[PDB]
Symmetry: C3
C-alpha cells in the first residue's frame, strides 16, 4: 500500500468518524516515555489494525494505537508505539501515519527518543534539543523519500535547513528555566544509525570526528516526512549513556539500561511536554 | 528485467533497425542542460517506451527519449531524460541503457549534472571537472553493481582508479582556455548523496571534513556501469550554490534556484560540449 | 525462507543424520585460503543444494559445501565457499548457515579474508587481527539484522563491544611468536565496504581520516550474526595491497593480484590456524 493522497484520505475518513476530535498537534513518544498518552482527556483509542491502509505491525508485536483527545486545552493525536525502520518497514509504511496526521489538521509534531551521547559534555539523564541531523541511510540511498514523489503532500527535492523549528526550541528551554532544570538541557546534532546493533566502540569514535553530538535509530524518517508536507517539528533526545566514555572504559549498553534511564526521567519529561503543549502559540 | 547480454542485445537490435546510426559517443545531460540534443543533425528520436526491455518510466513521468544523429561530424547517441536512483529504479533498470550504448559501439561517454559546492573556492555558476568520487551508497551495500555479475560486460570486482579519463579532462580545459572562460573551470571529487533531500547544513559540514569538493544525486551509477564495460568517461558539474556558505548564513536551496543557474549557463555549456565532441581523438 | 528457529532446525536435523559429527568449532575461509578444509580428517562433504532451507547459490556458481570432521583432535564444521552480500543475498540467506552452526553446537567461529590496507604501517602480505569494525551498511539501514528479531537466537538490540574475543587474539599472537613470524602480525579496525567495486582512491583517503585500518567486502555480517547468538569470534585479514600508497602512485588493484597474495601466504596461514584450533581452550 502506497502512502499516497487517496490512501491517506481513506484512513483519515475512518478516524474522523470514530473520534470526533480535530487535532492540530501530533506527538510520537519514545520507549518508556509514553505516560502522557495515558492522561489524554476525553480520549479515544484506535488500534492500528482497525484503520484502513495503516501498516501491518503484528510481526513485531507490542502496542500500536492512535490516541486522540485533549491536553492543556489543546486537541492532539498520539502514536502509541512508533514504527522503527530496523524492523524492516518500507518507506511507504513509515510515511502513511504522518501523512494521515497532516490530513487530520496537524500543524506541529512533538517527538522524543532515547539516544547515545557522543559529545563529551553529555551524561546519562541529560536532554538534547535537536537542531539538525546527519542521515546516514539518506546519503546511502535508503532515504525515507526514495520512490515516486507524492506531489499533493510536498516537493520532489525538500530543503531540511529549517526542519527543527527555532522558536519551539526556545520555548522548550524557557520552560526548563522556569522549573530550574535547565542544567540538564543541551542542544545538538542527531546522527541516524539504521540499527538494530548499537554503535560499536570504533563507530562511536568515528562519529565524534564527524561532528555528531548524539546517535540513535529513529526520528529522522518522521522528521523528513513532516518537513516535506509543512509540519513544524520539536525533537528531544534523552541520553542513556556516553558511548565515547564507554569505549574508553570497555562498558556495554543494553536495552535494560536504556529503559531504566527512561523510568528515571519519565515523570519530568511528562511535566515538561504537557506545559509545551499548553504554551504552543 | 535483468541488464544481461541477451536483453541488452534485443534493445540494440531494435535501435539499429529504426535509426541507421552507428554511434561511438554517448551523452547524458543534466536538468536544463539538454539544448544540444535539440541540434543533433539528421536525428532520430526514439521514446524509451517503444524500445524492448527499456525500463518503465511512466510513474515518474516527463521526457524519456533516446536520440541519435550527428554533431560536429561525429555520430552520437543521447539519453534525453536521465534515470535517477532516488525515484526507486533498480540496479538493473539503471544499467541496461548504458550496456545498450556499449553494444551500439559507444567508446566515450560525456556527462553533465548540477551539484552543490562544498570546497570553499566554489561559487554558483562555476564548472568542476570530476576527477574522482566518494560513493556513499556503494560503501553502504547499495552499489549499482550489487547482484550477479554479467560477465560478458566486465569483471566481478572493478577498479575505478582510472574511471575519469585524464586526457579528456585536459581537452575540456584546453577548450575553456581557447574561449577565455578558464576562470570558471575547477577540478574536484564528487560525493554521491542518494537523495532526494538536499544535503542538510550539518551533512554539508561533515562532507567538508571528509574531503568532498561537490555533492549531488546522480552520475556515479552511470560512471560505474561505463567503467565496468570499458567506456571512457568525462563528467562535469555545474555548481548551483555553495552549501557551506549557505549553512553559515541560513540560506536555503531549492529546485527553482537550480534551474535558474542552469538557464544562466546553458548556452556556454552547449558551445563547450559541441567543441569537445568535435575534437575527441 | 526466513532464518528462524524452525527452518534452521530442519537443516541441522539433516546434517546430523548424514555426518555423525558434533562440532564445537566453525570456520569460514577467505578466497584462496581454504587448503585446510581439504585436510579435515574422517570428513563428510555436504553440498549446500542438498541441505533443507540452505540458500540457493547457483546464480553465482562456484563451490558451496559444508564440510565436517576433525582437526588437531577437535570437531569442526567449515563453510567451503562463503556467501557475500555484493551478490545480492538477503539478510535471511546470510544468517541461516551461521544459525545452523549454533544449533549443531558451535561455540567458537574462526574467520579469514583478504583486504586492503589503509594504515600506513601495513604492507602486502601482512596479517591483521581484527579488534573492532566500522559497518557502513549498518549505519545506512542495510545491517544484516534489519527485519523481525528471531528471539530464540538473541536480543533485539545487540552490543558488539566484545564481538572480537580478546583471549583468542592473544592466543593467535602467541603462536605467531612461537614460530617467529610475529613481525607480520598487526591489530586493527576493519571497515565493511559493501562492494563489489574496490575502494576508489578518494574513498581510501576518506577511510584514513575516519580511523579505519583495513577495508573489505565480507566478515562483518557473519560476525554480527555470531555475536547475536553468543558465538565467540576470531577474524584475521591478509593484506593484499596498501590502498593509500596505491592512490599516491596511481597503482591499481585487481582480483588476480589478490589471489597471488593468497597463494603466497596460504601454507603459513594453514599451519597457523591448525595450531589455533588445536590449542583452543
Ligand atoms: C533507543 C536507541 O535507539 C538508543 C539508545 C542508546 C544508545 N546508546 C543508542 C541507541 O540507538
Ligand atoms: C541537481 C542536484 O542533484 C543538486 C543540485 C544542488 C545541490 N546543492 C545538490 C544537489 O544534489
Ligand atoms: C577480498 C576483498 O574483498 C578485497 C581485497 C583487496 C582490497 N584492496 C579490497 C577488498 O575488498
Amino acid at each position: 500500500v502506497v502512502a499516497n493522497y487517496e490512501n491517506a484520505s481513506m484512513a483519515a475518513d475512518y478516524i474522523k468518524r470514530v473520534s470526533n476530535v480535530l487535532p492540530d498537534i501530533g506527538i510520537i513518544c519514545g520507549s518508556g516515555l509514553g505516560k502522557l498518552i495515558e492522561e489524554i482527556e476525553e480520549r479515544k483509542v484506535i488500534p492500528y489494525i482497525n484503520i484502513p491502509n495503516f501498516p501491518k505491525t503484528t510481526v513485531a508485536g507490542h502496542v500500536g494505537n492512535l490516541v486522540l483527545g485533549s491536553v492543556g486545552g489543546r486537541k492532539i493525536v498520539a502514536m502509541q508505539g512508533r514504527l522503527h525502520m530496523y524492523e524492516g518497514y518500507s518507506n511507504q509504511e513509515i510515511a502513511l501515519p504522518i501523512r494521515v496526521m497532516k490530513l487530520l489538521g496537524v500543524r506541529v509534531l512533538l517527538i522524543t527518543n532515547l539516544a547515545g551521547g557522543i559529545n563529551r559534555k553529555l551524561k546519562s539523564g541529560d536532554f538534547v534539543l535537536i537542531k539538525g541531523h546527519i542521515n546516514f541511510p539518506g546519503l546511502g540511498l535508503n532515504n525515507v523519500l526514495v520512490g515516486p514523489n507524492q506531489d499533493e503532500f510536498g516537493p520532489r527535492f525538500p530543503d531540511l535547513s529549517n526542519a527543527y523549528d527555532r522558536l519551539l526550541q526556545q520555548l522548550a528551554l524557557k520552560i526548563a528555566q522556569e522549573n530550574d532544570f535547565q542544567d540538564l538541557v543541551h542542544e545538538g546534532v542527531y546522527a541516524f544509525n539504521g540499527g538494530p546493533t548499537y554503535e560499536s566502540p570504533d563507530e562511536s569514535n568515528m562519529l565524534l570526528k564527524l561532528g555528531c553530538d548524539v546517535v540513535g535509530m529513529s526520528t529522522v524518517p518522521e522528521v523528513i516526512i513532516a518537513c516535506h508536507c509543512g509540519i513544524k517539528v520539536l525533537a528531544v533526545s534523552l541520553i542513556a549513556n556516553n558511548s565515547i566514555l564507554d569505549a574508553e572504559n570497555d562498558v556495554s549498553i543494553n536495552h535494560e539500561k536504556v529503559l531504566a534511564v527512561a523510568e528515571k526521567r519519565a515523570d519530568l519529561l511528562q511535566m515538561w511536554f504537557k506545559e509545551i503543549i499548553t504554551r504552543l502559540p
